[PDB]
A paper describes a structure:
Their conserved modules include an inner tube, a contractile sheath and a baseplate complex. For firing of the extended apparatus, the baseplate undergoes a conformational change and triggers sheath contraction, which in turn causes the inner tube to be expelled and injected into a target. Here we performed structural and mechanistic studies on a clade Ib CIS gene cluster in the marine bacterium Algoriphagus machipongonensis PR1.
The central spike is surrounded by a hexagonal iris-like ring of Alg11-Alg12 heterodimers, forming the baseplate ‘wedges’ with the conserved core bundle and trifurcation units. Six copies of the gp25-like protein (Alg9) attach above Alg11-Alg12, where the C termini from two neighbouring protomers were observed to be slightly different. Like gp25 in the T4 phage, Alg9 mimics the ‘handshake’ to initiate sheath assembly and it interacts extensively with other baseplate components, implying a role in the initiation of contraction. Similar to Pvc12 and Afp12, Alg12 contains gp6-like and gp7-like parts. Domains I–III constitute the gp6-like part and participate in the assembly of the wedges, leaving the gp7-like part (domains IV–VII) exposed on the lateral surface of the baseplate. AlgoCIS exhibits a remarkable structural feature on the baseplate—the formation of an extensive ‘cage’ around the central spike. Interestingly, there is one additional large domain (IV, residues 278–643) protruding from the distal tip of domain III. The domains IV from the six protomers form a hexagonal cage that surrounds the spike (spike cage).
Author numbering:
A (entry chain e): 595 to 643
B (entry chain k), C (entry chain l), D (entry chain m): 2 to 142
E (entry chain Y), F (entry chain d), G (entry chain c), H (entry chain b), I (entry chain a), J (entry chain Z): 3 to 147
Amino acid sequence: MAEESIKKATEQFVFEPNDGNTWVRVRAMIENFLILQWRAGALAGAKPE
Amino acid sequence: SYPLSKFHFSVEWGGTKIGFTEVSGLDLETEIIEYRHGASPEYSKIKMPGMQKFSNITLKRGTFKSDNEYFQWYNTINLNKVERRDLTISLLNEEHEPVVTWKVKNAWPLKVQSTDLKGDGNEVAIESMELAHEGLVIQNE
Amino acid sequence: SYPLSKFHFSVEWGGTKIGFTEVSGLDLETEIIEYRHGASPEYSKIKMPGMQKFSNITLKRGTFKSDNEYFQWYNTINLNKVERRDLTISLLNEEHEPVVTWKVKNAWPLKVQSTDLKGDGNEVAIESMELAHEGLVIQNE
Amino acid sequence: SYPLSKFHFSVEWGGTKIGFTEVSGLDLETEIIEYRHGASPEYSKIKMPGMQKFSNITLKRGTFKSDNEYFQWYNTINLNKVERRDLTISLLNEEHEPVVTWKVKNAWPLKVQSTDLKGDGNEVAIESMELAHEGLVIQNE
Amino acid sequence: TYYPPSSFHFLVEFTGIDAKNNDHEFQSVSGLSVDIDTEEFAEGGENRFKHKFPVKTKYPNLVLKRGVLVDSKVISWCRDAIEDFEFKPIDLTVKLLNEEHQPLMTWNVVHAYPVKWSVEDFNAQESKMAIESVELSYNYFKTIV
Amino acid sequence: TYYPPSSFHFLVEFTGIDAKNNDHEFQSVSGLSVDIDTEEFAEGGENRFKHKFPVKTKYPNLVLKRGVLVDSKVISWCRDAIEDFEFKPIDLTVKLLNEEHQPLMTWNVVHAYPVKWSVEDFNAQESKMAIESVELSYNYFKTIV
Amino acid sequence: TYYPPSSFHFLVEFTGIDAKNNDHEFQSVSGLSVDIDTEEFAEGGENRFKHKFPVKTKYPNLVLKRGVLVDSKVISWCRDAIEDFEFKPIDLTVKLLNEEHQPLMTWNVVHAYPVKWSVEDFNAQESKMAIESVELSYNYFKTIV
Amino acid sequence: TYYPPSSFHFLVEFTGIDAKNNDHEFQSVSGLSVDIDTEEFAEGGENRFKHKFPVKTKYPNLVLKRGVLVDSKVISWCRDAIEDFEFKPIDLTVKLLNEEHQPLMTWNVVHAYPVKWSVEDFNAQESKMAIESVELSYNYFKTIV
Amino acid sequence: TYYPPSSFHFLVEFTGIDAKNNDHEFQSVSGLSVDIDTEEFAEGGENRFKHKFPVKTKYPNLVLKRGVLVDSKVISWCRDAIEDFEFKPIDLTVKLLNEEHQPLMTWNVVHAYPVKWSVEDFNAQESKMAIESVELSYNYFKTIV
Amino acid sequence: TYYPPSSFHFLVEFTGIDAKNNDHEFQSVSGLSVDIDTEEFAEGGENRFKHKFPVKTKYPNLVLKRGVLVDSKVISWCRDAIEDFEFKPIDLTVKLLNEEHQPLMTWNVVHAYPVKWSVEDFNAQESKMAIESVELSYNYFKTIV
């Protein structure tokens, strides 16, 4: 489940330039997906780190 | 192949004479609006035209017996009313015909200045006037 | 072994003539940002570059019969629109070829100034223009 | 038993030539902090030293064919980065050796000014530069 | 840093709204800060100070300004919320840039939506540009650096 | 835009009031903006932020200024409401114009009526124009562009 | 108008008080304006705006200033009200004049009486005129033009 | 008047306190004014205005300033009230003078007593005169002219 | 007086604290003033004024400023109160001096103790002296002259 | 002193946070002051003054400013508290320095933790440095000198 959702979220960056201004946007998006899963109780750990 | 000189000219202002000693202030001016958005690669601004301005016009002449034309025009001011006139200024050729013409819309007098008197003042008494207006067009064909 | 003189030059501005009496304002300027933290052993500030500026350019020429190029360019202003031009200024050698070139981006006229008239004005009537622009590059190879 | 003259000197600034027409601005300045307590018998203040300042340095030279050293240094500015240099200014003796030296830390160019052009300008075209810096030491042994 | 960076070179990007280059350029950005609400208590016998306790983390609205743009996608999004109560929150990135135009530091703004839209007054006697202003509410932000 | 438009060229038109050219010319226009009222809530266990919810869309009054005109139709309409409580709401259009004097963008102001009318103080020692000011209440606006 | 009138030429006249030429001349006049008090209501299901309703028409006090005059009839009238609670309301006319010294427009002020009277502070180190100020309450006004 | 009088030539005199020439000279006088408190009422069916009614006449305190005088009789009187609650009200006359040094107009201040006394701050780094200030409460005043 | 004294030459002395010459020198002194609290009453039938009655005499805190002194006795006294709630009130004398450095006039400040102590902000980019400020509460004062 | 010290040379040090030279340098420091809360009481028969009593000692927050630093240890510490409610108080020393760069005087700040963090607004049309600001709450301070 988690892999399919992330895969779809990253389709919007497929034809973007491959540089720092894209790498940072991809990271922010993935982290937002995962923080929600953590709050929901799927992921283990006291804090996101 | 030669430029024009600056001493042969005439002024039509609705008075009885067209000869003047000095004419100045025939200028045009536009304001500038500047802009820069934070993401621009250049660290300077882009410029475009704003609103427009005009300068006041100054006319100088010698004082003559029984000629009170400047005062009489000034004295037409009555609260917010004044006689407005079309002012035509022209640079002349050797046949005394126009070459370069400055056309001025809606002029009226802002101030009238008299001469100063001196015991040893061995010179001509010169009076002057300053005019407000609403626009200038330059013709040179 | 000798320096260049300052009287042989030409200006390309999109008009019909390239001869001018005077050209001025070809400057470049940068702002300075200053800083000092309280624990520093020195009692003065450290400096670094800020944003950039350019000066306006002034051009002067003699008035000629049937030449109204300055007015016509000025008169292309329509609210926020204006005809913008590439301005090229060049210092010439004895073969009348460029030596030093100043390249100016996006110029338009800010103001047009006419001459003053005098009864005893034994001189040439000189008109002038002031231009806004967005950048200057200097070439000397 | 005689003082030094002011016309024989050289400047080392990282460029290809050390000859200049004019050098100015080698100043040092300190601020003053004032104080008076109400019970004092004197009706004036006591003074002590504050923070320190330095002036900008101006350099002037004639324009030469294929020498674009001033522009090239200025053009190293990139947002907050610039090439900084050690500037050494020296007053010379009859053997062309240093007598008085001014040592300047971290200089960079603030502005570059080009010449003005004139139809009757029978003179040398002179360019100039203004430099920011972080400190001056004077040596005279 | 040894020489700290200036503040005049930055980029605003939106996620969930069709991109156009004219919607990434702004005159000014403000509101990237935070605070903690506290409560006080006096303990009998302790006369040197009162105790203070944290309660909540608080963030201000994000404010963006620019010259008026007539075909903006961001404004169409604002209108759907303003006129019909259709709300669909977005994420946003604020980037502070270096001389190679790459980020020095960024801010990740989470779950934002429009609360305000305005245009400054017209004046027949002044030479000025028409300026537009948009304000957004959001839940929190994180930083990457 | 690439070069954003200025704000000094515009037109105000009224629907439901007899037209005169002297009632379409104004010195200044203000009040074309909007905001959303919200409420806050603290959820137990969530210590990172408070929740915020929208409640209502809010608009300010529209304000018009000009030099005093003695035979105005708009003022006759204002007087009927002010003096006799006869209210008959109108619609209005605000137009921002281009160099061909055609609209860049317009605002559609719906169901407006007068709430205020005033003239600035007289002063025997100052050279000034007499200025008139009118304020209108309305329900909402839409834009066309 | 095409050229709107200026505000520095005007006349104040009183009805019910013996006339003197020195009581018709003033330095400044203010307070000729009006407003409408309103109330708000939220209708369930309508989320685009709140409703607004008029309640009352409101007028500010009329304020007159001039240099101090010692034998004024207007001040004697003010004193009877101030010192003895003898109140006898008057009517008043404010006239804005043209170049022939005839009215452009007038204001009819109905049923006025005094609520305030003062003279500005004295200062041994300044060169100034002594200035007097009078404020009147009234019910409403009408205009003629 | 035709040419109104200036305000820089005046005299303050006290009744009930031993006279000294140095207690009649002041830098500034203020507080010679009055106002009327009112109440409002809305009458059902009358929608053009609210009614207003007078209730009370009100006066501000009288304020006097001068350079510091060490042997003042007025200050000894102020101290008895300030330090011991011994109150003994006085009357006072304020005179505005003409070029022959005779009164143009006077104010009769009735039943006054001290409520405040102060001296301005000292500053070792400024060249200034020490200034004293006295404030009095009174019941009413009358004018003679 | 004929020529009133200036305010830049004065002395502050403390009783109950070990003396040092560096604790008698100050940049500025303020707070030497007093006021009387009053109450109002309306008597039925009396419409010319309300009655006013005194209740209490009131004094402000005394404020002293100077450049920072590190070994001050006054500050050690302030710290005992601030840190441990050990309070031991002192008396104080403020002297305004003449050209022979003798008192023109003095103020006797009775039963004072510390309520505040602060030092102004540091700034790496400004050339300024560090300034210290002390505020004292007291019961009353008397004057001698 | 005879010549008091200036305020532009100082050092901020932290205990409990890994040290870096770039976290000890600040543009400005403020908040090193204190006050005492009091209560008032009126005693019947005593009409010269009211009594005042101390209740509590009070301190303001400590505020630090500097240019933006991206790898700061202090900011990482602030983030743990801001984002996760993990609080771990620290001690701090403020040092005012002499010409040998040794302390003239120091302040011992006890048990501090972060309550605020912000960065000033960006502006595309101005040449400015990005400035960061941090505010800390603490219990009390002591001085050493």
